[PDB]
C-alpha cells in the first residue's frame, strides 16, 4: 500500500521503513543493473516484479490470548495478552467485560459536622437500619463505617481563641466539641447497633472559613486501612455537606506551605498533623482514590451540585446527586449512586512509556456505534451484559520488551499485556554459503551483508578502491542527474553517500537523493522537533498525537471544545486546537461576539411572550421564539431594557449559548410603567 525507503541494507532496515514495506529474499532477484534497494517495496510490487510470494518476508502484528486457567468469574477476559508488535502496524485485541456476579460492599459515611448540619446529624444518627436493609437488596451483608470532618483547626479556618476553641458552636449552646479536621469513628462493621453506639455518641462542632477541609479526611481515609480497614470488595465514600471544600494552595493563608504528605499520621483516630500540611490537590485524590479503588458519592446541597458535578470528570469513579437540607433522601441518593455508578464501565491503563500508544473502541450494548477514542467508556450497561473494548496498540520504535496493565476503573481485575518487538525477520546465517560475499561478510534473506571494509552486491569490491564508467550509467538516476546526486563517492554501480557530522544529518537513498533534514520546520525545529515528528526525504512523518506538513498541529480537538463539549461553540470550526470564529465571535471557544449588534430590540415580543404571556406573540409564542428558553433564575449575559406592547420597561438578561440565534432569558417579574 505504502512504502518509503529509509536506509535499506537488510530485511530489518526494510521493515523499520514502515508497515507496508516488505522484503524479497529470492536470490538474484537483484538485476545486474537493479541494485539491492529494489527488494524493499510493497508486497504487490515485489509480486509484479517476479518475487515468489513465499520469499516475501512480512512480519505482521498479532495478539495472543492466553486465558488464565479456570475457576472464578466470567466478568473480565482475556487475562493475558502477549503482543508481537511491528512498528506502525496496529496490534488490536478484544477485551470482553460482563459483570454479573454481585460482590460484597463497604460503605463509609463522611459527615460535615458544622453548625449548619444539625438538622442532618440528628436524622442520620437513627438510620443505620434502613442503610443495611437497602445495601443487602443487591449485595450480601453490607458494612458501615463512619468518619467526620470540619476543617483545619488553625486560623483562618476556625477561630483559635481559647473560649471559642472550647465552645466553637454559637455561644447559644453547649453540646458541641472543639473543632477538628477528621475524626475516625472506628471500623466498618456488621452491626447497626455498633453504628448507633459510636455515631450517636459524638458532638457537632463548627468552623470559621466557610469551605470544608474534607479533603484532608479522604486522604487520611485512603491512607489508614491499618486503623480503619477496608475489604477489597466495593469501597464507597459519601461526602455530605451544605458547604464547599478546601484544596491545595489554601494552606498558605495559615502560613503552612508544605503540601500534603499522603501518609497516615494518625493518633487516637484523629488527623492531628493536619495543621502542618496543605490540602491535597484535586487530582492528588482522584489518583489516590483510584489507587485504592474508592468511588466517592457527593451528597451535597442543591447549591453545591453544579460544582460537585464537575468532579466526575477528574475522577470518573464518582457520583453526584442533589438532596434536601434534611438528609431525608440519602437512601434514595445512594440507590441512585450505585445504580448509575455500576452502569458505567471505564477502561484505562498504566503509565505507558513515550514509545507506545493505546487507543480504544467502545461498543455499548444499547446500540451505541462508537470507535476510536482513547478511553473505554460505555453507559447504561445493565447486569450480566457483555460489552466490547477493542484495544489497539501501536508503537513507534523497535521497542524493548515490556509489560503493563490495562485495568477496569472501579475494580482490581487486571489484564496483563506484554509487548514484543517485530523487527528482525527470520533468515539463514553465516554458516550457509561463505563463498558468496567472498568470505568478507555473510548472507541474510538474499542480499549479502558485508564486513566494514567491503561493498558490492556480492561484497566483491572494497572501500579503498575504484569505480566503473559504464556502471556509472546506473550509479546515477538518469541522463540529466549527477552521479550519486553529489553527496556520494560512487563505487561499483552503487552509491556510498557522504558523511555530514552535524546533528541529525544523514544522506541516504539509492542515489543519495534524500536526507533527514530538508523537511518543513515548525516552531524552530526540524519537523517541529524530535518529539513532534521525523524528517524523511523532504517530508515530515509525524509522531502519534501530531499531524501536519511540519507536525504543525495536534490531533487533539480538545482545545476547540467548550465545557459543553461542542467544537467552537456553534459558531466556527476547529483547526489545530484552535477555533476559527465567524463574524466577530472571539477566541478561544467562539462563545462571545463582543461587538455584534446586541439583539435586545427584536426580542421585545419574545420576552413578554414567555414571562408575562402577553404581547403580539400570544398564541404565537413558542414558534415565534424558537431559539429562546426561559430561565427560572437570573442568567449571565446581556442586559436588555425596553418597552413592550403597553409601554412598560421590561428588564431582562439575554445569554447566548451554543448556536446561531439561540438564547436563555431571565425576565424580571417586575414590569415598570407610568
Amino acid at each position: 500500500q505504502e512504502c518509503t525507503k529509509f536506509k535499506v541494507s537488510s530485511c530489518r532496515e526494510c521493515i523499520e521503513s514502515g508497515p507496508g514495506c516488505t522484503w524479497c529474499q529470492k536470490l538474484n532477484f537483484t538485476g545486474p543493473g537493479d541494485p539491492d534497494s529494489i527488494r524493499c517495496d510493497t508486497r504487490p510490487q515485489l509480486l509484479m516484479r517476479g518475487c515468489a510470494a513465499d520469499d516475501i518476508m512480512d512480519p505482521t502484528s498479532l495478539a495472543e490470548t492466553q486465558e488464565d486457567h479456570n475457576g472464578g468469574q466470567k466478568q473480565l477476559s482475556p487475562q493475558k495478552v502477549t503482543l508481537y508488535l511491528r512498528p506502525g502496524q496496529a496490534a488490536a485485541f478484544n477485551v470482553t467485560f460482563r459483570r454479573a456476579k454481585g460482590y460484597p460492599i463497604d460503605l463509609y459515611y463522611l459527615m460535615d459536622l458544622s453548625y449548619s448540619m444539625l438538622d442532618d446529624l440528628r436524622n442520620v444518627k437513627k438510620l443505620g437500619g434502613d442503610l443495611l436493609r437497602a445495601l443487602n437488596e443487591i449485595t450480601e451483608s453490607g458494612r458501615i463505617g463512619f468518619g467526620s470532618f470540619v476543617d483545619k483547626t488553625v486560623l483562618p479556618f476556625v477561630n483559635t481563641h481559647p473560649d471559642k476553641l472550647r465552645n466553637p458552636c454559637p455561644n447559644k449552646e453547649k453540646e458541641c466539641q472543639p473543632p477538628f479536621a477528621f475524626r475516625h469513628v472506628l471500623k466498618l462493621t456488621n452491626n447497626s447497633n455498633q453504628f448507633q453506639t459510636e455515631v450517636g455518641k459524638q458532638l457537632i462542632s463548627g468552623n470559621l472559613d466557610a469551605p470544608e477541609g474534607g479533603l484532608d479526611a479522604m486522604m487520611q481515609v485512603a491512607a489508614c486501612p491499618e486503623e480503619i480497614g477496608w475489604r477489597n470488595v466495593t469501597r464507597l465514600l459519601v461526602f455530605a455537606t451544605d458547604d464547599g471544600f478546601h484544596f491545595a494552595g489554601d494552606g498558605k493563608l495559615g502560613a503552612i506551605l508544605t503540601p500534603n504528605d499522603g501518609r497516615c499520621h494518625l493518633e487516637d483516630n484523629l488527623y492531628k498533623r493536619s495543621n502542618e500540611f496543605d490540602y491535597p490537590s484535586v487530582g492528588q485524590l482522584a489518583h489516590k482514590l483510584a489507587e485504592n479503588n474508592i468511588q466517592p458519592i457527593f451528597a451535597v446541597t442543591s447549591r453545591m451540585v453544579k460544582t460537585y458535578e464537575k468532579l466526575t470528570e477528574i475522577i470518573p469513579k464518582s457520583a453526584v446527586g442533589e438532596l434536601s437540607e434534611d438528609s431525608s433522601n440519602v437512601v434514595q441518593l445512594i440507590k441512585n449512586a450505585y445504580n448509575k455508578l455500576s452502569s458505567r464501565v471505564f477502561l484505562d491503563h498504566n503509565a505507558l512509556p513515550d514509545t507506545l500508544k493505546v487507543t480504544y473502541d467502545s461498543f455499548c450494548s444499547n446500540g451505541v456505534t462508537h470507535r476510536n477514542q482513547p478511553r473505554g467508556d460505555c453507559d447504561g450497561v445493565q447486569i450480566n451484559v457483555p460489552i466490547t473494548f477493542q484495544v489497539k496498540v501501536t508503537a513507534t520504535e523497535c521497542i524493548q520488551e515490556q509489560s503493563f496493565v490495562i485495568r477496569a476503573l472501579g475494580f482490581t481485575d487486571i489484564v496483563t499485556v506484554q509487548v514484543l518487538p517485530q523487527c528482525e525477520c527470520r533468515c539463514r546465517d553465516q554458516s550457509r554459503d561463505r563463498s558468496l560475499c567472498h568470505g568478507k561478510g555473510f548472507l541474510e534473506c538474499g542480499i549479502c551483508r558485508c564486513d566494514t571494509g567491503y561493498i558490492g552486491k556480492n561484497c566483491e569490491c572494497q572501500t579503498q578502491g575504484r569505480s566503473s564508467q559504464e556502471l556509472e550509467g546506473s550509479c546515477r538516476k538518469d541522463n540529466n542527474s549527477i552521479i550519486c546526486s553529489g553527496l556520494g563517492d560512487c563505487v561499483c554501480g552503487q552509491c556510498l553517500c557522504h558523511t555530514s557530522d552535524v546533528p541529525g544529518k544523514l544522506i541516504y537513498g539509492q542515489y543519495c537523493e534524500c536526507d533527514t533534514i530538508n523537511c518543513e520546520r515548525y516552531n524552530g525545529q526540524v519537523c517541529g522537533g524530535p518529539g513532534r515528528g521525523l524528517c524523511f526525504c523532504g517530508k515530515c512523518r509525524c509522531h502519534p498525537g501530531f499531524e501536519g506538513s511540519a507536525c504543525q498541529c495536534e490531533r487533539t480537538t480538545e482545545g476547540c471544545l467548550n465545557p459543553r463539549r461542542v467544537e467552537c461553540s456553534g459558531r466556527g470550526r476547529c483547526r489545530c486546537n484552535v477555533c476559527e470564529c465567524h463574524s466577530g465571535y472571539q477566541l478561544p471557544l467562539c462563545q462571545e461576539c463582543p461587538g455584534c449588534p446586541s439583539p435586545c430590540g427584536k426580542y421585545i415580543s419574545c420576552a413578554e411572550c414567555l414571562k408575562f404571556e402577553k404581547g403580539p406573540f400570544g398564541k404565537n409564542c413558542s414558534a415565534a421564539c424558537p431559539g429562546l428558553q426561559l430561565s427560572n433564575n437570573p442568567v449571565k449575559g446581556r442586559t436588555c431594557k425596553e418597552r413592550d406592547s403597553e409601554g412598560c420597561w421590561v428588564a431582562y438578561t439575554l445569554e447566548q449559548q451554543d448556536g446561531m440565534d439561540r438564547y436563555l432569558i431571565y425576565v424580571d417579574e417586575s414590569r415598570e410603567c407610568v
Binding site: 493563608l253 484535586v282 468532579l311 540529466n480 549527477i482 553529489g486 558523511t499 557530522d501 523537511c519 472571539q586
Partner: protein, 1080 residues
C-alpha cells in the same frame, strides 16, 4: 540556555522557612523571607540580607511592633527600583478582640534613602457592635415595692455589664400608663447613666403590655429618641403576670416589632407562668425561637441567677433573617498577602476581605488608601481569593492591576482592573478551566520586546492535573480597549511529574541571549518528589511565548541536599555586579544565585581565490600529480551585530579554535592544505569587533577523478577564550540555536566540448499566481512561481538568488500525494541580510540535477511575510539565475517585480445602548419637537495608528417637513471640533408605498444630513464616543398615514483605502445603526 549551573552561589541558612520567599533588592542584595522563624516570644518571621561579594547572609534588624502578633513575616515580599525599596509582609497578624481572634496584615516599607514605614499606617481596630436595648418595666400594683426595688437593681445589674458607647439603653415603665424614664439620647449624654435609674418610682396600676410594646417600637427605637440608625435592636420585657384589660392584642402589635427588626425577650416572674396558657403568652411577647428568648423566674430572686447567662445570650448577637450566615468585611483580609509596587504607590493584597472575596489596597504618596475589588453587585466572587496574586500591567501610560483568585468557584480566575475617571473598575477578566486548577495562583507581566509596555501576562495553576504532568501557565495577551481578554498558549513541564508544581513561581529574567526578546523563568518545585526544578523559556517574536523550554535545571542535578528547588523566583538584576542579569531561586533552606553567560554572535565569510578550477589546472599531463596547482581560501571571522548586552573589553578579545576540512565526509579528498599535508587544518586566532581574515593555500593534484562536484571547505569552530580580562567572568558561549558548521564551494570549469568555447545562457522570470492586492498581516505567505530556462550551456549547481526586504524570507514547502506537474524538486536555500539599509538575499541551489541547455524548469518559492513587516507602500523583489560556474559576463539576468503595499487594520463602530428609542406623542401636540439622542462607539482594535473619517446620516427633512432639527455632533472627549455637514436631496420614490412596506424613515426617502468627522490620528486601542442630538419633530408623521413609524441614523468608518485595508471578513463592523420609534 545560558543559565550557568557550574559557578553558582548558594545561601543555606537554617532559619525556619528560610527561602520560602525571596526577591532581588537594590542591585546589591537578595532578600530572603523566613516566615516561621521564632524571633521573640509569640513572634514569627525573619528577614535576611545576602550579598554576592560576601557569600553570607545577615538578618535584618527591624524594630518589630508588639501590636502585631505572629504575622509570620517574610511570607510575602516585593521590591522596586525607581529608587531602591523593599516591602516585607507577614499577613497572619493575630489580633484578639476579647472573645474573637483575627488576622489583619502588617507590611514594612524599607529603603536605603529613607526610614522604615508600616502599612497600613493604622493598626486594625476591633470591630465593635452598636446595640440599642430597651427594658420594658411592668410597674403594675401586683408587684411589691420590695420586689420592684430588686428588679430595678437587676436593671442596673444588667446595664453595668454592657460597656458603652457600643451599647446604649432606654427605659420605659408600663401598667395602666406608660413612663419613659430615659431615652437612648439621654443615656448616651450622661456621665453616670445609672443615676437615671435611681430617679424612678413605681406606677402600680393595671397591665397593658401590648400597648406599651407598640409604644416602645414606634418611639424608643426611633432616631428622635437617640436610637442609632444601623444598630442591633433589642427589647427586654419584665413582667409578673398576664396582660389584663389590655385593649390591644399581641397579634395586633407584634408585626411592627418584627417589621423593624427588634429582638423580643420575655422575663416572666412567678408560678403564674408554670402552666400552658401563660407559656403561650410569653411566646407572643418574645421572638421565636422561644427558648432562646423566654426565661421563667421563680420570685424576684432567681432573676439575679440568670443575669450572667442572659448577659451571655444577648452578647451572642448576629443577623438571623438570612440563615445566620458568616458574612464578613475587612476583618481578616490579611492585607499585604500579595504585594506589588506600582508608580502610584504600593499595592497590598486583601484576601479574606468581605467573606474571602478579596481585593487590594493602593497606597498613594502619603495620602488616603483606596480599595480595589469588584462591586457588591458580583455575588459570585465570595470565597474566591481575588488578590491572592497581584501584579502590575503597564502599557504606554495608564497602570493596571491583575489579581488572581485561586478559588473562584473552585476553579480559578484572574481580573484586570484599571482606572475609569478617577475610579477603579474591571477592565476585563478571564477564568480557569479545570476545577481545582487554581488558576490565578501566579502572576507575571511580560514585556516581550522591551518597549516598556507589558505585552502579555502569565497566569499559573500549579496543581493542574493531567495523568503525566502537573501544573501549567496561561500565556494571556493584554486586551486593550474594553474588550474580551483571552489567552493564547498553554505551557507545561517535563512530564512524568503529575504534581511537579509547574506554574508555581514566575519571573521575567529579561533579555538573556541578546536577541531583543524577553526570557522568563518558571518554578516547578514539586518535581522529582518535591526536589524541584526551574525552567527557562524564550519569548517568541510578537505577543506570545515558546511552547517548549530551552533549559531545565532540576535542583536534584544541582545538589544531593536540595528540596523544593524553585519554590520562589526573582530575576532581573545584576546582584553579582558582573554586567549580566542574575536569577534568585529559593529552596527549602537555601537561596541560590544563577548567572547568565554572555552569548556571542560570530560572523563567517568564506571565499576562494580563484572562483573556479580551470581545466588548465585540472587537466592531466601524463605524469601523475605533477605541477600541483595553488588555490587560496580566504575566510573572515567577525563577532558582531549582537554585542548588545556588552561593550568594550571582554566584548573584544575572544580566542577561537578553527577546523578546516577539505572535501569532508567523502572518501577521496580532492584537495589538501599547503600548510600541512592533510585535508584538514586547525589554528587558533583572535577575534575582536572588525573581522580577522586569513588566506589558506590549497594544493590540488594534477589528476583528479571528479571535476564536477565542487570542492567544498567546511568550518567547525569553538570558543577557547578561557581567560578574559574582567569580572573573573563566566565562560562566554555561542547561541545554541545558531549554526557552527559553514561551507564554501570551489567549482571546476567544465568541458562543453573539446572544440567548443563554453558560454552559459540562462534566463529567469517569476510571478504571483492568483494574488490581488497585498495586505500585510492578512497575507502571511507569498507564493512565487519561478520559471527559469536554459538557452545555452548545461548548467551545474543552478543557483537562483532573490532580493527582498527584511520583512519576508523563504520557508521550505513540501508538496505531495501525486498532485501536480509542480515543484517536486529538491533544493537548498539560504537567507542572509545584505547591503546598507534593510534588504536580504535568499539564494537557492537546484541540487542533484544538471539544468540542460535546451530545457526549462518552473518551481515554487514561498516567502513568509511578517504581519508587522515594514515594506513601504511598494514591495520590490528581484531574481538572479546563474550556474556554479559564476556568470562570466556582463548584462545581468535580473528579473524584478514591484507591487503596491497595503496594511491591515481592524476598526469597529457600534450602536451605543443609551439612545432615546421610542419617543412618543399622541393626537394633540404635533408642533412640539423633542430632544432625541443617538450614540455611536468606535474602537481601533488593529495594530496601526491609522487616520479615519467617521460618517453619519440623519433624516432632517421628509417631503418639506422637518424631521430632525438643529442636529449637531457632540464629540465630548478629545473635542477636536472638526465635523462637517452636507445636505443631501433624497432618492425620489413613492414614499407612501415605500413607507407602507417597512415603515422606517432613513436616508432613502429623507433629505439627509451627512456628517464627516475626520480623526487625524486614530491611534490603536483608542475609543471615541460620538453623539447625534436634536429635537425630533412630530409634524411629519401625518404625511405618511401610519401609526408606528421608526427613524434611523447610520454610521460608517472610512479611511484611505489605498494605504490601509481592514482585516478580511470582519469588515461589516465599521458600519452601524441606531433607531428611535415614533408612535401616534
Amino acid at each position: 540556555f545560558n543559565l550557568d549551573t557550574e559557578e553558582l552561589t548558594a545561601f543555606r541558612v537554617d532559619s525556619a522557612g528560610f527561602g520560602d520567599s525571596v526577591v532581588q533588592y537594590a542591585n546589591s542584595w537578595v532578600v530572603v523571607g523566613a516566615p516561621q522563624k521564632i524571633t521573640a516570644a509569640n513572634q514569627t518571621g525573619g528577614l535576611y540580607q545576602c550579598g554576592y561579594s560576601t557569600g553570607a547572609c545577615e538578618p535584618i534588624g527591624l524594630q518589630v511592633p508588639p501590636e502585631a502578633v505572629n504575622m509570620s513575616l517574610g511570607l510575602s515580599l516585593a521590591s522596586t527600583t525607581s529608587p531602591s525599596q523593599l516591602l516585607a509582609c507577614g499577613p497572619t497578624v493575630h489580633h484578639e478582640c476579647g472573645r474573637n481572634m483575627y488576622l489583619t496584615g502588617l507590611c514594612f516599607l524599607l529603603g536605603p534613602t529613607q526610614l522604615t514605614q508600616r502599612l497600613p499606617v493604622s493598626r486594625q481596630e476591633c470591630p465593635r457592635q452598636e446595640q440599642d436595648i430597651v427594658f420594658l418595666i411592668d410597674g403594675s400594683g401586683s408587684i411589691s415595692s420590695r420586689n420592684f426595688a430588686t428588679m430595678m437593681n437587676f436593671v442596673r445589674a444588667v446595664i453595668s455589664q454592657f460597656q458603652r458607647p457600643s451599647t446604649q439603653f432606654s427605659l420605659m415603665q408600663f401598667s395602666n400608663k406608660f413612663q419613659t424614664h430615659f431615652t437612648f439620647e439621654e443615656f448616651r449624654r450622661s456621665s453616670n447613666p445609672l443615676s437615671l435609674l435611681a430617679s424612678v418610682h413605681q406606677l402600680q396600676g393595671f397591665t397593658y403590655t401590648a400597648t406599651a410594646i407598640q409604644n416602645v417600637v414606634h418611639r424608643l427605637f426611633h432616631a428622635s429618641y437617640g436610637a442609632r440608625r444601623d444598630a442591633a435592636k433589642i427589647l427586654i420585657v419584665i413582667t409578673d403576670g398576664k396582660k389584663e384589660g389590655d385593649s390591644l392584642d399581641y397579634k395586633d402589635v407584634i408585626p411592627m416589632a418584627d417589621a423593624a427588626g427588634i429582638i423580643r425577650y420575655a422575663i416572666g416572674v412567678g408560678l403564674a407562668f408554670q402552666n400552658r396558657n401563660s407559656w403561650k403568652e410569653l411566646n407572643d411577647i418574645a421572638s421565636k425561637p422561644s427558648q432562646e428568648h423566654i426565661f421563667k423566674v421563680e420570685d424576684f430572686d432567681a432573676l439575679k441567677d440568670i443575669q450572667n447567662q442572659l448577659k451571655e445570650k444577648i452578647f451572642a448577637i448576629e443577623g438571623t433573617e438570612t440563615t445566620s450566615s458568616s458574612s464578613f468585611e475587612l476583618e481578616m483580609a490579611q492585607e499585604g498577602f500579595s504585594a506589588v509596587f506600582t508608580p502610584d504607590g504600593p499595592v497590598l493584597g486583601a484576601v479574606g476581605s468581605f467573606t474571602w472575596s478579596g481585593g487590594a489596597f493602593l497606597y498613594p504618596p502619603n495620602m488616603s488608601p483606596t480599595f480595589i475589588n469588584m462591586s457588591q453587585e458580583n455575588v459570585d466572587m465570595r470565597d474566591s481569593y481575588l488578590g491572592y496574586s497581584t501584579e502590575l500591567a503597564l502599557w504606554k501610560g495608564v497602570q493596571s492591576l491583575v489579581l488572581g483568585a485561586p478559588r473562584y468557584q473552585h476553579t480559578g480566575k484572574a481580573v484586570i482592573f484599571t482606572q475609569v475617571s478617577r475610579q477603579w473598575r474591571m477592565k476585563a477578566e478571564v477564568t480557569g478551566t479545570q476545577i481545582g486548577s487554581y488558576f490565578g495562583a501566579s502572576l507575571c507581566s511580560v514585556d516581550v520586546d522591551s518597549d516598556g509596555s507589558t505585552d502579555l501576562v502569565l497566569i499559573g495553576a500549579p496543581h493542574y492535573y493531567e495523568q503525566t504532568r502537573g501544573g501549567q501557565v496561561s500565556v494571556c495577551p493584554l486586551p486593550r480597549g474594553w474588550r474580551r481578554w483571552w489567552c493564547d498558549a498553554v505551557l507545561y513541564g517535563e512530564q512524568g511529574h503529575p504534581w511537579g508544581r509547574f506554574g508555581a513561581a514566575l519571573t521575567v529574567l529579561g533579555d538573556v541571549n541578546g536577541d531583543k526578546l524577553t526570557d522568563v523563568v518558571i518554578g516547578a518545585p514539586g518535581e522529582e518528589e518535591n526536589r524541584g526544578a526551574v525552567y527557562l523559556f524564550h519569548g517568541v517574536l510578537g505577543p506570545s511565548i515558546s511552547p517548549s523550554h530551552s533549559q531545565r535545571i532540576a535542583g536534584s542535578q544541582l545538589s544531593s541536599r536540595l528540596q523544593y528547588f524553585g519554590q520562589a523566583l526573582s530575576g532581573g538584576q545584576d546582584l553579582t555586579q558582573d554586567g549580566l542579569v542574575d536569577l534568585a531561586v529559593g529552596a527549602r533552606g537555601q537561596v541560590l544565585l544563577l548567572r547568565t553567560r554572555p552569548v556571542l554572535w560570530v560572523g563567517v565569510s568564506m571565499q576562494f581565490i580563484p572562483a573556479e578550477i580551470p581545466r588548465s589546472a585540472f587537466e592531466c599531463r601524463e605524469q601523475v600529480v605533477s605541477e600541483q596547482t595553488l588555490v587560496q581560501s580566504n575566510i573572515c571571522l567577525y563577532i558582531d551585530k549582537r554585542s548588545k548586552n556588552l561593550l568594550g573589553s571582554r566584548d573584544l578579545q575572544s580566542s577561537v579554535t578553527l577546523d578546516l576540512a577539505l572535501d569532508p565526509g567523502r572518501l577521496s579528498p580532492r584537495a589538501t592544505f599547503q600548510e600541512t599535508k592533510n585535508r584538514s587544518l586547525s589554528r587558533v586566532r583572535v577575534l575582536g569587533l572588525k573581522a580577522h581574515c586569513e588566506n589558506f593555500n590549497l594544493l590540488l593534484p594534477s589528476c583528479v577523478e571528479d571535476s564536477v562536484t565542487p570542492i567544498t571547505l567546511r568550518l567547525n569552530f569553538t570558543l577557547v577564550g578561557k581567560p578574559l580580562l574582567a569580572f573573573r567572568n563566566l565562560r562566554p558561549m555561542l547561541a545554541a540555536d545558531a549554526q557552527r558548521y559553514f561551507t564554501a564551494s570551489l567549482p571546476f570549469e567544465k568541458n562543453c566540448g573539446a572544440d567548443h568555447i563554453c558560454q552559459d545562457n540562462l534566463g529567469i522570470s517569476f510571478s504571483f499566481p492568483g494574488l490581488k492586492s497585498l495586505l500585510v498581516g492578512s497575507n502571511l505567505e507569498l507564493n512565487a512561481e519561478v520559471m527559469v530556462w536554459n538557452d545555452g550551456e548545461d548548467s551545474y549547481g543552478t543557483t537562483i538568488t532573490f532580493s527582498h526586504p527584511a520583512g519576508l524570507s523563504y520557508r521550505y514547502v513540501a508538496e505531495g500525494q501525486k498532485q501536480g506537474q509542480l515543484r517536486s524538486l529538491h533544493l537548498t536555500c539560504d537567507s542572509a541580510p545584505v547591503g546598507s539599509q534593510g534588504t536580504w538575499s535568499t539564494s537557492c541551489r537546484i541540487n542533484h540535477l544538471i539544468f540542460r541547455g535546451g530545457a526549462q524548469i518552473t518551481f515554487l518559492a514561498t516567502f513568509d511575510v511578517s504581519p508587522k513587516a515594514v515594506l513601504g507602500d511598494r514591495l520590490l523583489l528581484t531574481a538572479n539565475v546563474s550556474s556554479e560556474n559564476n556568470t562570466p559576463r556582463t548584462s545581468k539576468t535580473t528579473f524584478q517585480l514591484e507591487l503596491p503595499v497595503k496594511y491591515a487594520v481592524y476598526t469597529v463602530v457600534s450602536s451605543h445602548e443609551q439612545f432615546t428609542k421610542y419617543l412618543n406623542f399622541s393626537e394633540s401636540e404635533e408642533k412640539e419637537s423633542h430632544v432625541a439622542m443617538h450614540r455611536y462607539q468606535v474602537n481601533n482594535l488593529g495594530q496601526r495608528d491609522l487616520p479615519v473619517s467617521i460618517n453619519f446620516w440623519v433624516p432632517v427633512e421628509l417631503n418639506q417637513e422637518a424631521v430632525w432639527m438643529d442636529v449637531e455632533v457632540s464629540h465630548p472627549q478629545n473635542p477636536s471640533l472638526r465635523c462637517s455637514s452636507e445636505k443631501i436631496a433624497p432618492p425620489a420614490s413613492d414614499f407612501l408605498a415605500h413607507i407602507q412596506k417597512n415603515p422606517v424613515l432613513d436616508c432613502s426617502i429623507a433629505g439627509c444630513l451627512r456628517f464627516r468627522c475626520d480623526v487625524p490620528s486614530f491611534s490603536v486601542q483608542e475609543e471615541l464616543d460620538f453623539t447625534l442630538k436634536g429635537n425630533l419633530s412630530f409634524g411629519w408623521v401625518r404625511q405618511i398615514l401610519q401609526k408606528k413609524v421608526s427613524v434611523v441614523s447610520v454610521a460608517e468608518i472610512t479611511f484611505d483605502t489605498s494605504v490601509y485595508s481592514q482585516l478580511p471578513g470582519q469588515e461589516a463592523f465599521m458600519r452601524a445603526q441606531t433607531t428611535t420609534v415614533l408612535e401616534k
